[PDB]
Scaffold this active site. Sequence first.
Site, PDB file in Angstrom:
ATOM      1  N   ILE A   1       0.818  -1.209   0.000  1.00  0.00           N
ATOM      2  CA  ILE A   1       0.000   0.000   0.000  1.00  0.00           C
ATOM      3  C   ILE A   1       0.852   1.259   0.000  1.00  0.00           C
ATOM      4  O   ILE A   1       0.440   2.299  -0.524  1.00  0.00           O
ATOM      5  CB  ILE A   1      -0.881   0.073   1.281  1.00  0.00           C
ATOM      6  CG1 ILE A   1      -1.886  -1.072   1.276  1.00  0.00           C
ATOM      7  CG2 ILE A   1      -1.543   1.455   1.402  1.00  0.00           C
ATOM      8  CD1 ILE A   1      -2.516  -1.334  -0.078  1.00  0.00           C
TER       9      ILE A   1
ATOM     10  N   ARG B   1       4.292  14.123  19.196  1.00  0.00           N
ATOM     11  CA  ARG B   1       3.895  12.887  18.495  1.00  0.00           C
ATOM     12  C   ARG B   1       2.638  13.246  17.710  1.00  0.00           C
ATOM     13  O   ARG B   1       1.525  13.244  18.224  1.00  0.00           O
ATOM     14  CB  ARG B   1       3.643  11.779  19.509  1.00  0.00           C
ATOM     15  CG  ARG B   1       4.930  11.318  20.195  1.00  0.00           C
ATOM     16  CD  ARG B   1       5.917  10.803  19.186  1.00  0.00           C
ATOM     17  NE  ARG B   1       6.974  10.035  19.821  1.00  0.00           N
ATOM     18  CZ  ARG B   1       7.911   9.398  19.138  1.00  0.00           C
ATOM     19  NH1 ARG B   1       7.917   9.474  17.789  1.00  0.00           N
ATOM     20  NH2 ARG B   1       8.797   8.653  19.796  1.00  0.00           N
TER      21      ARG B   1
ATOM     22  N   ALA C   1      14.501   7.123  21.927  1.00  0.00           N
ATOM     23  CA  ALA C   1      14.232   5.886  21.186  1.00  0.00           C
ATOM     24  C   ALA C   1      14.256   6.114  19.689  1.00  0.00           C
ATOM     25  O   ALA C   1      14.046   7.227  19.196  1.00  0.00           O
ATOM     26  CB  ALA C   1      12.822   5.349  21.584  1.00  0.00           C
TER      27      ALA C   1
ATOM     28  N   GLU D   1      20.629   6.552  19.055  1.00  0.00           N
ATOM     29  CA  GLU D   1      19.487   7.431  19.270  1.00  0.00           C
ATOM     30  C   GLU D   1      19.653   8.271  20.546  1.00  0.00           C
ATOM     31  O   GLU D   1      19.202   9.408  20.617  1.00  0.00           O
ATOM     32  CB  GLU D   1      18.192   6.606  19.303  1.00  0.00           C
ATOM     33  CG  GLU D   1      17.852   6.017  17.921  1.00  0.00           C
ATOM     34  CD  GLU D   1      17.206   7.030  16.975  1.00  0.00           C
ATOM     35  OE1 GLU D   1      17.221   6.798  15.751  1.00  0.00           O
ATOM     36  OE2 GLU D   1      16.695   8.059  17.461  1.00  0.00           O
TER      37      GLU D   1
ATOM     38  N   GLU E   1      14.873  15.805  10.561  1.00  0.00           N
ATOM     39  CA  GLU E   1      13.809  16.691  10.138  1.00  0.00           C
ATOM     40  C   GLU E   1      12.661  15.753  10.459  1.00  0.00           C
ATOM     41  O   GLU E   1      12.668  14.584  10.059  1.00  0.00           O
ATOM     42  CB  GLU E   1      13.873  16.961   8.628  1.00  0.00           C
ATOM     43  CG  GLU E   1      14.739  18.158   8.255  1.00  0.00           C
ATOM     44  CD  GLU E   1      16.125  18.110   8.885  1.00  0.00           C
ATOM     45  OE1 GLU E   1      16.649  19.183   9.267  1.00  0.00           O
ATOM     46  OE2 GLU E   1      16.699  17.000   8.993  1.00  0.00           O
TER      47      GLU E   1
ATOM     48  N   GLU F   1      11.734  15.364  13.709  1.00  0.00           N
ATOM     49  CA  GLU F   1      11.832  15.149  15.152  1.00  0.00           C
ATOM     50  C   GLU F   1      11.726  16.480  15.880  1.00  0.00           C
ATOM     51  O   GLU F   1      12.592  17.358  15.745  1.00  0.00           O
ATOM     52  CB  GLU F   1      13.158  14.471  15.546  1.00  0.00           C
ATOM     53  CG  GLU F   1      13.252  13.028  15.146  1.00  0.00           C
ATOM     54  CD  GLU F   1      14.493  12.342  15.691  1.00  0.00           C
ATOM     55  OE1 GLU F   1      15.603  12.882  15.501  1.00  0.00           O
ATOM     56  OE2 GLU F   1      14.356  11.258  16.298  1.00  0.00           O
TER      57      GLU F   1
HETATM   58  N1  LIG Z   1       4.677   7.239  11.221  1.00  0.00           N
HETATM   59  C1  LIG Z   1       5.615   8.035  10.675  1.00  0.00           C
HETATM   60  N2  LIG Z   1       5.335   8.613   9.524  1.00  0.00           N
HETATM   61  C2  LIG Z   1       6.179   9.435   8.890  1.00  0.00           C
HETATM   62  N3  LIG Z   1       7.380   9.730   9.408  1.00  0.00           N
HETATM   63  C3  LIG Z   1       7.759   9.159  10.629  1.00  0.00           C
HETATM   64  C4  LIG Z   1       6.875   8.271  11.310  1.00  0.00           C
HETATM   65  N4  LIG Z   1       7.463   7.837  12.464  1.00  0.00           N
HETATM   66  C5  LIG Z   1       8.636   8.379  12.561  1.00  0.00           C
HETATM   67  N5  LIG Z   1       8.844   9.207  11.458  1.00  0.00           N
HETATM   68  C6  LIG Z   1      10.013   9.925  11.348  1.00  0.00           C
HETATM   69  O1  LIG Z   1      11.080   9.328  12.380  1.00  0.00           O
HETATM   70  C7  LIG Z   1      12.225  10.282  12.642  1.00  0.00           C
HETATM   71  C8  LIG Z   1      13.678   9.823  13.169  1.00  0.00           C
HETATM   72  O2  LIG Z   1      13.042   8.900  13.992  1.00  0.00           O
HETATM   73  P1  LIG Z   1      13.191   7.754  15.177  1.00  0.00           P
HETATM   74  O3  LIG Z   1      13.896   8.394  16.487  1.00  0.00           O
HETATM   75  O4  LIG Z   1      13.895   6.433  14.653  1.00  0.00           O
HETATM   76  C9  LIG Z   1      11.731   7.295  15.421  1.00  0.00           C
HETATM   77  P2  LIG Z   1      10.737   7.002  16.939  1.00  0.00           P
HETATM   78  O5  LIG Z   1       9.947   8.207  16.027  1.00  0.00           O
HETATM   79  O6  LIG Z   1      11.199   7.554  18.427  1.00  0.00           O
HETATM   80  O7  LIG Z   1       9.932   5.826  16.909  1.00  0.00           O
HETATM   81  C10 LIG Z   1      10.031   4.510  17.381  1.00  0.00           C
HETATM   82  C11 LIG Z   1       8.826   3.919  16.933  1.00  0.00           C
HETATM   83  O8  LIG Z   1       7.474   3.781  16.883  1.00  0.00           O
HETATM   84  C12 LIG Z   1       7.227   2.905  15.734  1.00  0.00           C
HETATM   85  O9  LIG Z   1       6.276   3.556  14.882  1.00  0.00           O
HETATM   86  C13 LIG Z   1       8.551   2.747  14.937  1.00  0.00           C
HETATM   87  O10 LIG Z   1       8.924   1.423  14.440  1.00  0.00           O
HETATM   88  C14 LIG Z   1       9.498   3.414  15.773  1.00  0.00           C
HETATM   89  O11 LIG Z   1      10.725   3.490  15.243  1.00  0.00           O
HETATM   90  C15 LIG Z   1      11.325  11.612  12.609  1.00  0.00           C
HETATM   91  O12 LIG Z   1      11.893  12.696  12.152  1.00  0.00           O
HETATM   92  C16 LIG Z   1       9.837  11.303  11.979  1.00  0.00           C
HETATM   93  O13 LIG Z   1       9.253  12.231  11.124  1.00  0.00           O
HETATM   94 MG   LIG Z   2      13.017   8.787  18.521  1.00  0.00          MG
HETATM   95 MG   LIG Z   3      16.207   7.181  13.907  1.00  0.00          MG
HETATM   96 MG   LIG Z   4      15.535   9.683  16.720  1.00  0.00          MG
END
Ligand SMILES: Nc1ncnc2c1ncn2[C@@H]1O[C@H](COP(=O)(O)CP(=O)(O)OC[C@H]2O[C@@H](O)[C@H](O)[C@H]2O)[C@@H](O)[C@H]1O
Ligand SMILES: [Mg+2]
Ligand SMILES: [Mg+2]
Ligand SMILES: [Mg+2]
Lengths: 182, 182
Positions: free
Chosen positions: A12, A62, A74, A90, A137, A139
């Site tokens: 999808i 979030r 994380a 991280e 970008e 975060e």
């Molecule tokens: N659903 C999404 N849609 C579009 N862009 C996204 C989404 N989730 C995360 N990102 C991008 O993840 C970034 C670096 O992220 P992590 O610091 O790696 C990520 P962390 O965000 O803390 O999350 C841990 C988790 O929850 C679960 O959804 C994931 O498997 C996961 O990794 C950000 O800048 C976000 O925009």
């Molecule tokens: Mg994170």
């Molecule tokens: Mg990351």
């Molecule tokens: Mg991160």
Amino acid sequence: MSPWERILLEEILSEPVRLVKERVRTHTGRELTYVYRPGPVAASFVLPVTERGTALLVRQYRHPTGKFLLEVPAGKVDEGETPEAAARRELREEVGAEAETLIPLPSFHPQPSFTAVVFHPFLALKARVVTPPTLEEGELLESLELPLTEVYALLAKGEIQDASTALTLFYAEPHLKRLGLL
Amino acid sequence: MSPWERILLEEILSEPVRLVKERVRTHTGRELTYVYRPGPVAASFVLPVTERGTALLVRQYRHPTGKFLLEVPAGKVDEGETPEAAARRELREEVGAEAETLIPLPSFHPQPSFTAVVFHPFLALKARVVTPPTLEEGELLESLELPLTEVYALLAKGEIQDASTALTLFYAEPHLKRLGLL
Ligand SMILES: Nc1ncnc2c1ncn2[C@@H]1O[C@H](COP(=O)(O)CP(=O)(O)OC[C@H]2O[C@@H](O)[C@H](O)[C@H]2O)[C@@H](O)[C@H]1O
Ligand SMILES: [Mg+2]
Ligand SMILES: [Mg+2]
Ligand SMILES: [Mg+2]
Ligand SMILES: Nc1ncnc2c1ncn2[C@@H]1O[C@H](COP(=O)(O)CP(=O)(O)OC[C@H]2O[C@@H](O)[C@H](O)[C@H]2O)[C@@H](O)[C@H]1O
Ligand SMILES: [Mg+2]
Ligand SMILES: [Mg+2]
Ligand SMILES: [Mg+2]
């Protein structure tokens, strides 16, 4: 030996998140469409505790919830990276911190009805800030420092809304008491 | 007062799960595409404990993981239904059980990075089986009964893989000890 048979698996979306819609034949012999985020995929969650018995946390926006949540740092485990390495990376990116020992805690599936993802929690000891954060970008977060007593009071009061952060705190608790940090 | 501005919200899928792809302007003024399961949406999770200090759980196939997981009964809160009513309804559907008092526990977001869903945990007392289960097409599970001491030993050993079940058990624990069931 899966109880459900694949008829057709349709992608999808491929980026920024991979999502599939799979037509399967179930245990009843009938067809069903199941939508999910396929595996293998993982993320690491790390509770960074200082030698002063405080924790380095993040207050992060979030988007799906419209809220800023109090969380442990994380992130996603990259291709070919181990969960511990993702945890350290991280922690450095989001809080600008490093730590010494990382104690692995029980892994868990945050939402097995929809995603294959496995979350890997860790308790990082002797955490300390050593550099500025390097956020992606996408975060939007700020790091903060709270005494462990306050963090666990928030947990007991039911104020920690992020499930993974709450569970990491529950699993970390006995170790913190054993080590004399709580 | 959201930090991100909507440019365009596209619906990627409407059923069986609603998923959107939203183009937003972030805190950096740049554009980003965010994919998520929009709210408002919720599910209730209920730990059913009997007067004999046992718990009525389910061993359920969770397709995205390919595994059968040990979980507390749970399900989506339907339109116009309260979380407690969904908890009682899913308990009756999945385990064929009813209970007396339901103590609400802290709600939580299982995966705020991807979904707006709020999970509502409950501890149900005087749980008892009264009818056959009524499972949906798509639900493959069996109910079982385990002494609370065994369930909490599994929790301590890190063997409860479903996050929501693990968190519900952690939040329920003090109440169970207070009530003399653990
Ligand atoms: N659903 C999404 N849609 C579009 N862009 C996204 C989404 N989730 C995360 N990102 C991008 O993840 C970034 C670096 O992220 P992590 O610091 O790696 C990520 P962390 O965000 O803390 O999350 C841990 C988790 O929850 C679960 O959804 C994931 O498997 C996961 O990794 C950000 O800048 C976000 O925009
Ligand atoms: Mg994170
Ligand atoms: Mg990351
Ligand atoms: Mg991160
Ligand atoms: N991702 C999916 N794709 C296609 N069909 C699906 C999916 N998830 C659940 N179903 C259908 O949910 C049924 C009745 O379910 P709950 O007993 O209501 C559901 P419970 O399954 O225990 O889940 C609680 C939760 O996890 C989160 O994903 C949800 O918001 C949530 O409700 C099943 O028969 C499934 O096939
Ligand atoms: Mg269910
Ligand atoms: Mg249901
Ligand atoms: Mg159900």
